[PDB]
Write an enzyme that holds these catalytic residues in place. Structure first.
Site, PDB file in Angstrom:
ATOM      1  N   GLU A  75       0.817  -1.218   0.000  1.00 46.68           N
ATOM      2  CA  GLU A  75       0.000   0.000   0.000  1.00 46.68           C
ATOM      3  C   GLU A  75       0.848   1.264   0.000  1.00 46.68           C
ATOM      4  OE1 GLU A  75      -3.609  -0.044  -0.145  1.00 46.68           O
ATOM      5  OE2 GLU A  75      -2.898   1.871  -0.957  1.00 46.68           O
ATOM      6  N   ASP A  79       0.784   4.027  -3.111  1.00 46.46           N
ATOM      7  CA  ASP A  79       0.206   5.338  -2.853  1.00 46.46           C
ATOM      8  C   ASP A  79       1.114   6.473  -3.320  1.00 46.46           C
ATOM      9  OD1 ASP A  79      -1.862   3.859  -1.649  1.00 46.46           O
ATOM     10  OD2 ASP A  79      -1.203   4.346   0.384  1.00 46.46           O
ATOM     11  N   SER A 275      -7.533   1.468  -3.303  1.00 45.66           N
ATOM     12  CA  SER A 275      -6.278   1.904  -2.721  1.00 45.66           C
ATOM     13  C   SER A 275      -5.525   2.853  -3.652  1.00 45.66           C
ATOM     14  CB  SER A 275      -5.409   0.683  -2.388  1.00 45.66           C
ATOM     15  OG  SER A 275      -6.218  -0.420  -1.989  1.00 45.66           O
TER      16      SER A 275
END
Ligand SMILES: [Ca+2]
Length: 354
Positions: A75, A79, A275
C-alpha cells in the site's frame, strides 16, 4: 491489460502543464514502508521527476519496509508512486502510525494540523467497516475531517476493496470508514478500458469474491447529507435500514485486471484496488489547486451541484461479491458503486475556475 498512472491520467483528461508545484500531499500509512530510492528508479522509468518525499513518525511508528509486497509495503509504495507520478512537482508527506483506531486517528490529526509540512491534500488508502470503529474514534475522526475542511484540506479515502459486504462475513451489507464520513471524498473503483485518451469502456470493478470489488453502499451510521438529497441515494439494502450517506462520491480505475504498473519492493508488478484511486485523485486536486492559486479543500457539496458532464457516468455492473443479488448496482447518475463516476479533469478544473 495494465496502465502507467500517466495512461490513466490521460484517459481522465487530467489538466496538462500542472505538476502540483506549491502543493504538499499527505499520505496516511499504517504499516510497511518505502525505499526512497526504488521510488526514484520507478519515477525515472516513467520519465517524470522524483518528487521530494518526507516520512513522519506517529505514535512511535515509522517508515519500516517489511519486504513483503503482499503486506503493508504494497500500500505504501502504491500510494506514493501513483500520486507522485501524477503530481511530481508536489511535496509528499508520509505519516506512519500503528494499524489501530487510535494511531489512524492520530496520523490523520497530525497531517492535517501539521504546521511544518502543511498538506493541502490528504490521501487515505486504509480503513475498516464503519461498525468496527470505536464510537470515540468515529467522532474524533469526524472532528478531524471537519478541521481539514476548515483548513482547506481535501481528504480523499479509498472506499474499500471487498465489495458491498466490505470483508464482513455476517451476511449484511456494510460501508468502510473513513470513506463513509460525509466530510471525506470517497473513492470507488471501476474497470477501465481506454486507448488514445478515450474511454472505451468503464464499468464497476467486480472480480468476484476472489479478485475483489469496489466498496460502496449506504451508511447506517451517517445520515444522508444535505448535498446528497438529489442523488437518489437508496436506503441501505439491509432489512430495516434507513437513509444514510451514500458511498462513494467519485470513482476511478481500480481493477487489477487493468491495473497500475508499479514497482513494489524492487519488483515490477501490476496492482489495483480503490487503494490506488485516492492517490490518483489526490494528484488531480493538487494540479487544480496549483492552477487556482488556492486550495479547493472540501469538495463534496460542490461536486453534487456541478453539471453532470463534468463526470464520466458508470452505468453498468455491481459491487456484490457475497451473493447473486447484485447489491449494489450501477446506474444513470450517482450510484452506490461509483458515485458520480470518473471525474473529467479539464472540466472539473474549468467548473471550479473563478
Ligand atoms: Ca452511474
Amino acid at each position: 491489460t495494465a496502465y502507467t498512472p500517466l495512461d490513466v491520467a490521460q484517459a481522465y483528461q487530467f489538466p496538462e502543464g500542472l505538476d502540483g508545484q506549491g502543493q504538499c500531499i499527505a499520505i496516511i500509512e499504517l504499516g510497511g514502508g518505502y525505499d526512497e530510492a526504488s521510488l526514484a528508479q520507478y519515477f525515472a522509468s516513467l520519465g517524470v521527476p522524483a518528487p521530494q518525499v518526507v516520512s513522519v513518525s506517529v505514535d512511535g511508528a515509522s517508515n519500516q519496509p517489511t519486504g513483503d509486497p503482499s503486506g503493508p509495503d504494497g500500500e505504501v509504495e502504491l500510494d506514493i508512486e501513483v500520486a507522485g507520478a501524477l503530481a511530481p512537482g508536489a511535496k509528499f508527506a508520509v505519516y506512519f502510525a500503528p494499524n489501530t483506531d487510535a494511531g489512524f486517528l492520530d496520523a490523520i490529526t497530525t497531517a492535517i494540523h501539521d504546521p511544518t509540512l502543511k498538506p493541502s491534500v490528504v490521501s487515505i488508502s486504509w480503513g475498516g467497516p464503519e461498525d468496527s470503529w470505536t464510537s470515540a474514534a468515529i467522532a474524533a475522526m469526524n472532528r478531524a475531517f471537519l478541521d481539514a475542511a476548515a483548513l482547506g484540506v481535501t481528504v480523499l479515502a479509498a472506499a474499500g476493496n471487498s465489495g458491498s459486504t466490505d470483508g464482513e462475513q455476517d451476511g449484511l451489507y456494510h460501508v468502510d470508514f473513513p470513506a463513509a464520513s460525509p466530510y471525506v471524498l470517497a473513492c470507488g473503483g471501476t474497470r477501465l478500458v481506454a486507448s488514445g485518451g478515450r474511454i472505451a469502456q468503464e464499468t464497476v470493478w467486480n472480480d468476484g469474491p476472489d479478485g475483489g470489488a469496489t466498496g460502496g453502499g449506504v451508511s447506517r451510521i451517517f445520515p444522508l447529507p444535505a448535498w446528497q438529497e438529489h442523488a437518489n441515494v437508496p436506503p441501505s439494502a439491509n432489512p430495516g435500514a434507513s437513509s444514510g450517506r451514500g458511498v462513494p462520491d467519485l470513482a476511478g480505475n481500480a481493477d487489477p485486471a487493468t491495473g497500475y504498473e508499479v514497482v513494489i519492493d524492487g519488483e515490477a508488478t501490476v496492482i489495483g484496488g480503490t487503494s490506488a484511486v485516492a492517490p490518483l485523485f489526490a494528484a488531480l486536486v493538487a494540479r487544480i489547486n496549483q492552477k487556482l492559486g488556492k486550495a479547493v479543500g472540501y469538495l463534496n457539496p460542490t461536486l453534487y451541484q456541478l453539471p453532470a458532464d463534468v463526470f464520466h457516468d458508470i452505468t453498468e455492473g455491481n459491487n456484490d461479491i457475497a451473493n447473486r443479488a447484485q447489491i449494489y448496482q450501477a446506474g444513470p447518475g450517482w450510484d452506490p458503486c461509483t458515485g458520480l463516476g470518473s471525474p473529467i479533469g479539464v472540466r472539473l478544473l474549468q467548473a471550479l475556475l473563478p
